[PDB]
Design a protein around this ligand. Sequence first.
Ligand SMILES: O=C(O)CNC(=O)C(=O)O
Ligand SMILES: [Mg+2]
Ligand code: NI
Ligand SMILES: [Zn+2]
Length: 331
Amino acid sequence: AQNPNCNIMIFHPTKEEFNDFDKYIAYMESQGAHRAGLAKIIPPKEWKARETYDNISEILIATPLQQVASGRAGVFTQYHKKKKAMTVGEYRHLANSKKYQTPPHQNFEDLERKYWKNRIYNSPIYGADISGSLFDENTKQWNLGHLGTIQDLLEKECGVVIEGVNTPYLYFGMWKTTFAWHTEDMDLYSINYLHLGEPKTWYVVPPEHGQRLERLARELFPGSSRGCGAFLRHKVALISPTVLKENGIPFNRITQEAGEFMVTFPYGYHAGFNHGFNCAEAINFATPRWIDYGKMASQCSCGEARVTFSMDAFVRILQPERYDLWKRGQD
Ligand SMILES: O=C(O)CNC(=O)C(=O)O
Ligand SMILES: [Mg+2]
Ligand code: NI
Ligand SMILES: [Zn+2]
């Protein structure tokens, strides 16, 4: 069995290997990359996402979100407070302000220490889930707006034709912006490209050990667990690496820098934080190997998780027994 310790693997495809996206994902899996839940892909030196980032300031962040924490430094939740609209140029100036800018630090490890010590005492502002793309249309390789759609994958594998679309989303971050512990909708894959700016640190639990993280989360968040049998779908709970180590939960960590892709694999729980002002693009995708994970994915039916239109069909076709309850949670 490849990668039996479930380490995060880093790939360096050549320009030739970068042509066929599906083939390269299958290659990484042949080497055991999915066992980690996360992989890093460094694009060939000849590749670029677009020519420059000099003209992005006028993109609108319609509903910036202030991420307010509650709890203790290593075990906390966050809620998202809506703020007034602002442009990317306005948001960048805000991220760089004395109130929000990255503090002086020695290296990524020192910054990680400062994040877990101090995150809860501040409320950073995030642009999230902004439909759009920063890939140039002429970028043919690994262009996250030109991938094969999940609806087409389901049709190819299972024969069923369904409604729905699959487009990418932009994220604008600043120091201490935080992504809570979660798997993707329907335990899909994700791909994330860091277009510009400061890094993102990721934490990940191997898919084969995801239920260990779920059991710890039920212990640490006991009222939320009573409220919903899939409350991590709410995407609000944080647990630090020190707490995970104290509780014996298997995990790994890695820092993504600008110009790098990260792939999350089905049922790989992940969480993390941004180091400073940045912009990322991400989208969900599927392969044949996902189908079995989609069929088994937990679902939130309490009303909190509310998701895209296109998840309806996935539930309806892959999880018909659950469909009526889940749809009630959507309405
Ligand atoms: O950029 C982001 O905020 C978050 N990305 C992910 O959790 C992902 O690609 O799965
Ligand atoms: Mg612009
Ligand atoms: Ni994710
Ligand atoms: Zn719920």
